[PDB]
Structure formats: structure tokens, C-alpha cells
Coordinates of N, CA and C in Angstrom, one line a residue:
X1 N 12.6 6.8 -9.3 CA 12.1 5.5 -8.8 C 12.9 4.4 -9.4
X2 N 13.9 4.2 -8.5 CA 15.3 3.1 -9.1 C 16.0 3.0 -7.7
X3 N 16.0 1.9 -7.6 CA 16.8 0.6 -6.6 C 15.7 0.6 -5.4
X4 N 14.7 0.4 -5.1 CA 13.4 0.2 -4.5 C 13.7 -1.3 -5.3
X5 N 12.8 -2.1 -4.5 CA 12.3 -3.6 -4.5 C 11.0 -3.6 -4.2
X6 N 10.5 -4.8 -4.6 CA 8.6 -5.0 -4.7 C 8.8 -6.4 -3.7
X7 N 8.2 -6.8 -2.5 CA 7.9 -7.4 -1.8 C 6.5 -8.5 -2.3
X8 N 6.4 -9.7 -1.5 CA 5.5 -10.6 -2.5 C 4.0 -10.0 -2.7
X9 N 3.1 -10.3 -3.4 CA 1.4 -10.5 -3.3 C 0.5 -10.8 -2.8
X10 N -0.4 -9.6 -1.9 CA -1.0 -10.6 -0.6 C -2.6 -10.1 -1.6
X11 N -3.6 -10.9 -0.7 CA -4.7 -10.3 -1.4 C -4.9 -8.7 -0.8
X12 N -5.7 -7.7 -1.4 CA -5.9 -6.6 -0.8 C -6.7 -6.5 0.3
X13 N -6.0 -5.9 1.3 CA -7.3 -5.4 2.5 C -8.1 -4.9 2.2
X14 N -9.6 -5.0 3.2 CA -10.7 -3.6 3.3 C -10.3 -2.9 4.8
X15 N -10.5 -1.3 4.5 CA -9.9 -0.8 5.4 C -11.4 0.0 5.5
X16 N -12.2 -0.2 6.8 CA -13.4 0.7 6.8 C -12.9 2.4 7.0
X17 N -13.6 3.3 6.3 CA -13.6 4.6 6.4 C -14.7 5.7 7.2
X18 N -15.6 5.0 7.8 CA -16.7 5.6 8.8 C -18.4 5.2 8.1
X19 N -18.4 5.0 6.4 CA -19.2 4.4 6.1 C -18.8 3.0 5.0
X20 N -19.8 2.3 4.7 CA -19.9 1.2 4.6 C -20.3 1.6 2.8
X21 N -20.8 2.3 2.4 CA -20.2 2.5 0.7 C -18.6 2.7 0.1
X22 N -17.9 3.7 1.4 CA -16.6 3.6 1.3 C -15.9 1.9 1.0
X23 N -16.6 1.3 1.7 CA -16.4 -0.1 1.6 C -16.6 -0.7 0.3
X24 N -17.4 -1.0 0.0 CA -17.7 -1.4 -1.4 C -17.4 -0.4 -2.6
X25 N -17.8 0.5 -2.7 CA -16.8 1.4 -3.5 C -15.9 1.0 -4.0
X26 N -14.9 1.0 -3.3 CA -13.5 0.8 -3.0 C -13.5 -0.8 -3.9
X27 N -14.0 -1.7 -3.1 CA -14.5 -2.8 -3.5 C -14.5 -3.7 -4.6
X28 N -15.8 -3.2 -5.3 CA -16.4 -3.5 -6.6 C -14.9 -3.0 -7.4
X29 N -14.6 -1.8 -7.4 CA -13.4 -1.4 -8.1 C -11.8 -2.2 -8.1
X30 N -12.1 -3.0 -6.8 CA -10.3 -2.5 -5.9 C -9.2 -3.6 -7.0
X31 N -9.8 -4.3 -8.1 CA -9.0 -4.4 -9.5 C -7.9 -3.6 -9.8
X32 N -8.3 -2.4 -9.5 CA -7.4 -1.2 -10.1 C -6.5 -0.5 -9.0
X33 N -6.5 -1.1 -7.9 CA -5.9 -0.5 -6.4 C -4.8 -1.2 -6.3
X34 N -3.7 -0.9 -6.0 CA -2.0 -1.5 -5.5 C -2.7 -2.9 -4.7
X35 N -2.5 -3.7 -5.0 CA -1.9 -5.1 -4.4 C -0.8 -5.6 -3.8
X36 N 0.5 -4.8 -4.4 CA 1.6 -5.3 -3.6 C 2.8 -3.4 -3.6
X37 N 3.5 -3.3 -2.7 CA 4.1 -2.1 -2.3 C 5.9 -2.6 -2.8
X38 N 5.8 -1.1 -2.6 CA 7.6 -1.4 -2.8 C 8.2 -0.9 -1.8
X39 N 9.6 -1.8 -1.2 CA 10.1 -1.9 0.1 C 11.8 -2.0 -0.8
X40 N 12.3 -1.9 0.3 CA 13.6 -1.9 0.4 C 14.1 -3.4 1.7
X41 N 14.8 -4.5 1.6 CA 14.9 -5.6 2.3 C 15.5 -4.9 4.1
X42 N 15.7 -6.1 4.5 CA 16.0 -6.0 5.8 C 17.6 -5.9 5.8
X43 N 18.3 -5.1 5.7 CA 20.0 -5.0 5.8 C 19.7 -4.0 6.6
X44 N 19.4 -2.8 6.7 CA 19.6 -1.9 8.1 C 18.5 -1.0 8.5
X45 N 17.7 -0.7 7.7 CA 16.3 0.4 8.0 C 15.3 0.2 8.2
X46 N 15.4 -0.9 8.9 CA 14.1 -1.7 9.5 C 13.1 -0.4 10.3
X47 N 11.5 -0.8 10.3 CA 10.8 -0.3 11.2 C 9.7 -0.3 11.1
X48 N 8.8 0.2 12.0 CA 6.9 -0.3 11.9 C 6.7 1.0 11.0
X49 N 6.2 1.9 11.7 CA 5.2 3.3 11.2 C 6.5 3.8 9.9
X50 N 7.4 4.6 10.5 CA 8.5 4.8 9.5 C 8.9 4.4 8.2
X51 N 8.6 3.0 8.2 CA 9.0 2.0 7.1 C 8.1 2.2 6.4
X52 N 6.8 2.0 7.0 CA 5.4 2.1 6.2 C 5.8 3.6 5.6
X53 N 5.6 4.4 6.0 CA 5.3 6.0 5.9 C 6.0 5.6 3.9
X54 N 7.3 5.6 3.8 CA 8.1 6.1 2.7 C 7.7 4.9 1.5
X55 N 7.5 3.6 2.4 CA 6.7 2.4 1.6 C 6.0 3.2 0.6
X56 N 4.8 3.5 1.4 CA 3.7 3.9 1.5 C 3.3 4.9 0.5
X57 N 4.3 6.4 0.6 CA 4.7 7.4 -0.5 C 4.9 6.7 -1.5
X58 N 5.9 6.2 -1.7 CA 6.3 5.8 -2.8 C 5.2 4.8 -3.4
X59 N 4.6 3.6 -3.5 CA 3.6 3.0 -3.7 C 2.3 4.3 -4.1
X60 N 2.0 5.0 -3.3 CA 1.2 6.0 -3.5 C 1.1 6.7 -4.9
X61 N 2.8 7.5 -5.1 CA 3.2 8.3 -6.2 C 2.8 8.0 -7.3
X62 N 3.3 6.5 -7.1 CA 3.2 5.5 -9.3 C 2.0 4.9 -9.0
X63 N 0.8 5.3 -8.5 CA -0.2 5.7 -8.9 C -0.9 6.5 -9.3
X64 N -0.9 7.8 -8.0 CA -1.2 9.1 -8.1 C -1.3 10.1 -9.5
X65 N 0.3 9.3 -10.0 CA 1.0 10.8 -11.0 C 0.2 10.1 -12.3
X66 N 0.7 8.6 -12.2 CA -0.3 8.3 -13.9 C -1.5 8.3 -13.9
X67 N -2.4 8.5 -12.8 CA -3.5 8.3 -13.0 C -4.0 9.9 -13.6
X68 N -3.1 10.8 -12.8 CA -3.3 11.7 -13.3 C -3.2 12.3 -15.0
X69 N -2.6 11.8 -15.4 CA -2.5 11.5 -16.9 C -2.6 10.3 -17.6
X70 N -3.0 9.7 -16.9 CA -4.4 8.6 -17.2 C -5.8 9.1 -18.2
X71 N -5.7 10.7 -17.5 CA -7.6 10.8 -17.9 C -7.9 10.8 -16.9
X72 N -7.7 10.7 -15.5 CA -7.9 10.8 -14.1 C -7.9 11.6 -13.2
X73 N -8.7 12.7 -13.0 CA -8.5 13.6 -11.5 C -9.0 12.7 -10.5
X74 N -7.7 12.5 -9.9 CA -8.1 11.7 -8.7 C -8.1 13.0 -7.4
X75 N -8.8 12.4 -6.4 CA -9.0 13.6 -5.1 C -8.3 12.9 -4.2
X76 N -8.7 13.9 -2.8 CA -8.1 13.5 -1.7 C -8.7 12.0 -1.0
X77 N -10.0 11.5 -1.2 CA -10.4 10.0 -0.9 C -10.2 9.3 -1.8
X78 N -9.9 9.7 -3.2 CA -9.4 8.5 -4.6 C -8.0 8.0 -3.8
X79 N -7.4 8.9 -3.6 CA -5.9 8.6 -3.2 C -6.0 8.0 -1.7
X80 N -6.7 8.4 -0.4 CA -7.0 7.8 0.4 C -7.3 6.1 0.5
X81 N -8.2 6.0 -0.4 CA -8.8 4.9 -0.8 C -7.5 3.7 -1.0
X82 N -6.6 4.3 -1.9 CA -4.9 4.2 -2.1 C -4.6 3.8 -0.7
X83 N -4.4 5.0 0.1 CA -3.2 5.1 1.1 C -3.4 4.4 2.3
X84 N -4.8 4.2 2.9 CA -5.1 2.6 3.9 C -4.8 1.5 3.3
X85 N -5.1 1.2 2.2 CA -4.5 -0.1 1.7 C -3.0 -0.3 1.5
X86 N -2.6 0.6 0.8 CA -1.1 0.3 1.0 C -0.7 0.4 2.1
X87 N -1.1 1.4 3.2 CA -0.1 1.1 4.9 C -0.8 0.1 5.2
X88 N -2.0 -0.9 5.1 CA -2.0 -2.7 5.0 C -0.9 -3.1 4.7
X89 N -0.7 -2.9 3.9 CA 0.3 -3.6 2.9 C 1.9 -3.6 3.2
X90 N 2.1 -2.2 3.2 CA 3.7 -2.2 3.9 C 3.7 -2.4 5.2
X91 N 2.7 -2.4 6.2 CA 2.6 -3.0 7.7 C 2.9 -4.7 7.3
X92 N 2.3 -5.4 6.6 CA 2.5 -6.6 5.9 C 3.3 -7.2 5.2
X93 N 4.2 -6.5 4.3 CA 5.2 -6.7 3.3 C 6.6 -6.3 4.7
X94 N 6.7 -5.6 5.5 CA 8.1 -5.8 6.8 C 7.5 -7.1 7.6
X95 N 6.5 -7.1 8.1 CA 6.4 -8.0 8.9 C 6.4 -9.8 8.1
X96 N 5.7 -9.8 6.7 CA 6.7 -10.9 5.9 C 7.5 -11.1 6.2
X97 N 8.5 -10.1 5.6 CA 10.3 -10.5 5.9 C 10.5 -10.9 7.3
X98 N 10.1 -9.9 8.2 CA 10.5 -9.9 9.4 C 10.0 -11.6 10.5
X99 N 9.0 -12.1 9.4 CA 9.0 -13.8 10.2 C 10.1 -14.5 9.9
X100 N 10.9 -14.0 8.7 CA 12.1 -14.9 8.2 C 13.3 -14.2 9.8
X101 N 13.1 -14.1 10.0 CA 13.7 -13.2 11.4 C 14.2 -14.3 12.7
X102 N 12.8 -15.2 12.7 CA 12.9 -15.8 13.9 C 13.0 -17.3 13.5
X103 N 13.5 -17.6 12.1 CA 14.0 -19.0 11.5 C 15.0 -18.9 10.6
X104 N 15.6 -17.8 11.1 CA 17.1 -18.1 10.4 C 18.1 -18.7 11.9

């Protein structure tokens, strides 16, 4: 995890999950949930879903692994909980840059 870049600070999204505790859950906690992703700038590998996806992993990972040795068995919705809000995020963190697009 070296030559990746961190994109600015938005506040965090709520991403509903089918119920409405998922919501607040998430919530009351989401202090401790990624706020901002790591991207790579606009020079050639631009993209929507794609861009997100590896965003997305990576952002994911350097939480996943320390939480894990944190003291933390996180599961498949701990990490979930994770993985809608970051693809918020890196959907948000390309399309940032990508307004600098149509004012240069």
C-alpha cells in the first residue's frame, strides 16, 4: 500500500440495507467508518464501476486487516457496512476530480 493517493473529505453517506437498524447501527457508530478513499488522479485510468471496484478494495483492506488485529472479528455486514459507503465515496472522490474536467 504505496503510491495510491487520498482524494478530499466529504461527509459520510447512509446507504440503506433493507432495514432501517442497518441504518442507525451503522449510524450511531459511523465515527469509526472510512470518510475519505484512496484513488489514484486523473492521468489515464479513469472510470465509473471499475475505478470504484479497486478504490473500493483498497479502502476496504486498511480497515478490514487492522481491525482484525484490533481485537475485532469483523463479518461479512461489519465489512459491508464498510463497502456501500466507500463505493459512495469513490463514486464521489472520480467524479470530484472529474468536475475539474469541464473548467479547465
Amino acid at each position: 500500500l504505496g503510491g495510491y493517493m487520498l482524494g478530499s473529505a466529504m461527509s459520510r453517506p447512509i446507504i440503506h440495507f433493507g432495514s432501517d437498524y442497518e441504518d442507525r447501527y451503522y449510524r450511531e457508530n459511523m465515527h469509526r467508518y472510512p470518510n475519505q478513499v484512496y484513488y489514484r488522479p486523473m492521468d489515464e485510468y479513469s472510470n465509473q464501476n471499475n475505478f470504484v471496484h479497486d478504490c473500493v478494495n483498497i479502502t476496504i483492506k486498511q480497515h478490514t486487516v487492522t481491525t482484525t488485529t484490533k481485537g475485532e472479528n469483523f463479518t461479512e455486514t461489519d465489512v459491508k457496512m464498510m463497502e456501500r459507503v466507500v463505493e459512495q465515496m469513490c463514486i464521489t472522490q472520480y467524479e470530484r476530480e472529474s468536475q475539474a474536467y469541464y473548467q479547465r
